[PDB]
Design a protein around this ligand. Structure first.
Ligand code: CWX
Length: 155
């Protein structure tokens, strides 16, 4: 089991850390959601699906910077939503193919004015936890999520 990003970096077998850079809607109003879709950013696969089933959770999602100070909301993981920043580990998603499969995570963030997220800033850290039905591997793939652009909340 290993993963790759839309910015051309990787995390190999056994886990590790990578940076992800997301383009964000430049304007989000109060009462609206800013969507941060990681399924277009993070892709993973199973290295031996003939015999091994991989299980993948969002272990913890943490907020930083302007997201931490100016937003609340949810994380949607494989079709169900939970508070973000997270308060539990999600259910598992199965990875059962060598073919790249998106990691089905998206943040829905709503403003609690002006530049609310600064370009280049860290907005979130998402920990992907991978186990399997084969051995006792239990690995963390740590994704540091950065904004590529400013996000403005109008008055
Ligand atoms: C080379 N001979 S073989 O066909 O029998 C063979 C080759 C590779 C493997 C192999 C076993 C464990 C592996 O472990 C990783 O990949 C798993 C499947 O994605 C993960 O569950 C593990 O955590 C680990 O990343 C990867 C490849 C097994 C058999």
């Amino acid at each position: 089991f290993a993963c790759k990003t839309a910015n051309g970096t990787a995390i190999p077998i056994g886990g590790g850390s990578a940076n992800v850079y997301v383009n964000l809607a430049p304007v989000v109003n109060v009462g609206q959601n800013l969507v941060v879709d990681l399924s277009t950013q993070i892709f993973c696969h199973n290295d031996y699906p003939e015999t091994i089933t991989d299980y993948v959770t969002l272990q913890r999602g943490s907020a930083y910077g302007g997201v931490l100070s100016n937003f609340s909301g949810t994380v949607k993981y494989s079709g169900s939503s939970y508070p973000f920043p997270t308060t539990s580990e999600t259910p598992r998603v199965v990875y059962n193919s060598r073919t790249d499969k998106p990691w089905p995570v998206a943040l829905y963030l709503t403003p609690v004015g002006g530049v609310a997220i600064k370009a280049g800033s860290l907005i979130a850290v998402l920990i992907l936890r991978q186990t399997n039905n084969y051995n006792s591997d239990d690995f963390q793939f740590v994704w540091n999520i950065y904004a590529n652009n400013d996000v403005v909340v109008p008055t």
